[PDB]
Amino acid sequence: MASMERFLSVYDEVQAFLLDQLQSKYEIDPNRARYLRIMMDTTCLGGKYFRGMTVVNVAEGFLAVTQHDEATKERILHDACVGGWMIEFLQAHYLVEDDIMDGSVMRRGKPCWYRFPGVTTQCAINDGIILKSWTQIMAWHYFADRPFLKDLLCLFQKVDYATAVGQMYDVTSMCDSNKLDPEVAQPMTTDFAEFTPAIYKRIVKYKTTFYTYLLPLVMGLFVSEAAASVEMNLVERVAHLIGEYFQVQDDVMDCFTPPEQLGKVGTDIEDAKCSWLAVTFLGKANAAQVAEFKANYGDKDPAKVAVVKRLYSEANLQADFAAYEAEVVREVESLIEQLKVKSPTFAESVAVVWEKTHKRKK
Amino acid sequence: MASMERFLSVYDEVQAFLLDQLQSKYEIDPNRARYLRIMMDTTCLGGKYFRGMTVVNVAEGFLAVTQHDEATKERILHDACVGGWMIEFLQAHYLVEDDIMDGSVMRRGKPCWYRFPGVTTQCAINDGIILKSWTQIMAWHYFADRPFLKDLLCLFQKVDYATAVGQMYDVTSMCDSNKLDPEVAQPMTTDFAEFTPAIYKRIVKYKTTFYTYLLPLVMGLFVSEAAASVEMNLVERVAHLIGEYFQVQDDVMDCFTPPEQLGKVGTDIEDAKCSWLAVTFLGKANAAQVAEFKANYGDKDPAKVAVVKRLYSEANLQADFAAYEAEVVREVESLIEQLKVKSPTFAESVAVVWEKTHKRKK
Ligand SMILES: C=C(C)CCOP(=O)(O)OP(=O)(O)O
Ligand SMILES: C=C(C)CCOP(=O)(O)OP(=O)(O)O
Ligand SMILES: [Mg+2]
Ligand SMILES: [Mg+2]
Ligand SMILES: [Mg+2]
Ligand SMILES: [Mg+2]
Ligand SMILES: [Mg+2]
Ligand SMILES: [Mg+2]
What we know:
Chain A is mainly α. Chain A has helices at residues 4-26, 30-44, 50-63, 70-102, 121-142, 149-171, 197-223, 232-256, 259-262, 268-271, 276-282, 287-294, 302-314, 317-342, 344-358; strands spanning 106-107, 110-111. Helices cover 72% and strands 1% of the residues of chain A. Chain A has a two-stranded antiparallel sheet with strand order 1-2. Chains A and B meet through helix 2, helix 4, helix 5, helix 6 and helix 7 of A and helix 2, helix 4, helix 5, helix 6 and helix 7 of B. The PDB classes it as transferase.
C-alpha cells in the first residue's frame, strides 16, 4: 500500500536527521550511531502503525474537502507524517519500559528490546527514555515555526503524563490499596477485592486511551489546523470508548491469541494483572471457581497458568466479550453519528479507525 | 538566605498542586496519592539543592542591580523557584533511573528508590518517568503566559536529550566500540583503550554538565529576561568546565569518601565505569600496575575491589586531583573575569556557584 510507504519514508527522513545530528552536535561515534539506528528500527518499526497512520488519515480527510495551495497540502501531509511518528516514537518508549516492567520476552515477533542478546536491561531503561526524548526533538525541529506548536506540545505532555499515571495504576493493580506503602514490603492481593469494572476502567482509561486514540486524533487536527471544526468533547468520548475496547482486545489476546499470530507472549496471568478477563471472570465465577482461580493466578508456573486458562474457557468469556463488543459498536456508531454534525470527514476518519480496530486480529 | 526559605516553601506549593490535580483530574485514590507524595519527597528532597538554588541565586543577582516593583520582584523570585524545582525534579528522574542502572544501594543516606522496602524496580522505573513528566506539567501551569516559555521548554528538551545521550555514553563506557552490536552478546573491554581523557570528557560533558550547570544558569537568565545581557558563549564554557570538574569530584568521592559522609555507596569500580580515576590511573601506571588493574577491575568481589583502591592509592591519584583542581581554578576565574565585561553581577553568581562546588564534600 502506497502511503504506508510514504509514511515509512518520512521515518527515513526523521532517522537520518536524528542520527546526522548525533554525529554533528553530540560527538557520537559510528558504532553507537549504529546501535541507536538499530534500537530505533527495532523499537519504532514492526507494529500496525495505527496511531501514526490515524494522524495521516485524519489530515487526508480535511485536505480532500478543503482549499489549500499545493505547498500547504504538502506541508500538512508532511506534518501529518511527522506527528504520526512522534506518536509511534511515544509508543516505542512505552513498550520498551513496559516490557521490562511486565517481565515480557517478545515484541512484534522479535525479542523484547531489553532481551536483545547484546542489549542488557540497564541501557534499555535509558534507550526507552531516549525514545521519548526524540519525540521532543522532532517537535522542535519540524514544527519550530508552526502555529500549532504550543497546543501540540502541551497536549503531547498531558497525554504522556496520563499514560505514566495509568501505567502506575497498571503496575500496582495486584496490590491491596489499603496496603500500598513504600515503607512496608508489598504482598500481592488475596481477596482480589479490587478487581472490579470501575477499577479496571480507570487503569485502561489512563494507560491506553489517551495516547492511542485521543493523541492521534487531535494531532491530525492540529497539523490540519482544524480543531475548530469539531466538538472536542465528542472526540474525547469516542477516543475513550474505542481506546477501552482496544485495551480489552489486548487483554483477551494476551490469553487466547497464540504467540505466533500475536507477535508477543502473554504475561498478564503470570503477572497477576487486573485484566478484562480476570475482572470479567471474577464477576461471574462461583465459589469453587473463585477458589481455584485464587490458588493459581499470579504465578509463572505453566501448570498454574494453564489452570487459569481452563477456567477462562469454562467461564464462556469469549461470549461476554462479544456482548461487550456489540454494546461498544452501538456506542461508537452513535458517537460517529454525532460527529457527522460538525465534521462529516472527521466522522468518516473515526469510522475507518473504528473499523480497523474492530477487526484487528492483531 | 531567606532565599533558601522561599525555595522550599514553593515546593510545598508545587507538591499540593500536583497532588490535588491528581485527585481532581486523574481519579487517584488516597493510597496512591500517598505513594506519590512519599516518592516525590524521597527522590526530590534531601539533596544539596545546588541546581535549584543556582537559578534562584542567578535571578537574585538581577533583582539586586535592576529595580522593580515588589510585585514583579516576587513574580520573578517565584518563577525562579519553580524553574529551580523543574531542574531538581529532573535530577530526581535521572537519579532514580541511574540507581537502577548502576545497581546502587543508597541515595542521600537512604535506600535507593527502587530498593525501598515496598517499591518494585518495575514501578520505580515508572516513578522515575513520572518525575520527568512532572517537570513538564509545572512548566505549562506556572509558565503559561511567560514570554520565555518557548525558549525555556526548548532548552529543557535539549538538555534532557543531551543528558540521555550521555547516560548512554556512560553506561556503555566499559564496551569495545568496535563490538557494540545489539544482536551479538558483548563481553566487557579488556584493553581499556577507550579509557581516555577525550572519551571521559565526552561522557561527562553530556551526562552532567548541561543539566547540572548549563540549565540552572541559563534558566536564571530566562526567568529574569536577562539572557541578552550575558555572553552566552562564556556561560556555555564556564558551565562545561565547572560541570566536568563537578563530575570528577563525584568519581573521586565514589571511591574515597565514606558512605557516612557521602550519602551513597560507591560502585564505579564494581561497574567497570570509565571514571576519572580509572583514566587518570591508566595515564600513569607502569606495565605491572596496568596488568594488576585489568586483572581486578569490573568485579563485585570485595577483594578485587580493594586491590584497585590499593592501586589507586599507590599512584597518588589524590595528588593528581589537586593538580587538576588548581588548573580548574585558573580557568574558572579566567572565565569569571571575562563575564564581568558585560555582566558583573552574573559573574558573581557564577563565582558563588563555583565556591559551593569547589569546597563541597557532599
Ligand atoms: C494495547 C496497547 C495499547 C499496546 C499494544 O499496542 P499495539 O498492539 O497497537 O502495538 P503495535 O505493535 O501496533 O505498535
Ligand atoms: C554528580 C551528579 C550529576 C549526580 C549527583 O548529584 P548531586 O551529588 O548534586 O546530588 P544532590 O544530592 O545535590 O541532588
Ligand atoms: Mg506489557
Ligand atoms: Mg503492561
Ligand atoms: Mg497486553
Ligand atoms: Mg550513578
Ligand atoms: Mg552512572
Ligand atoms: Mg558517582
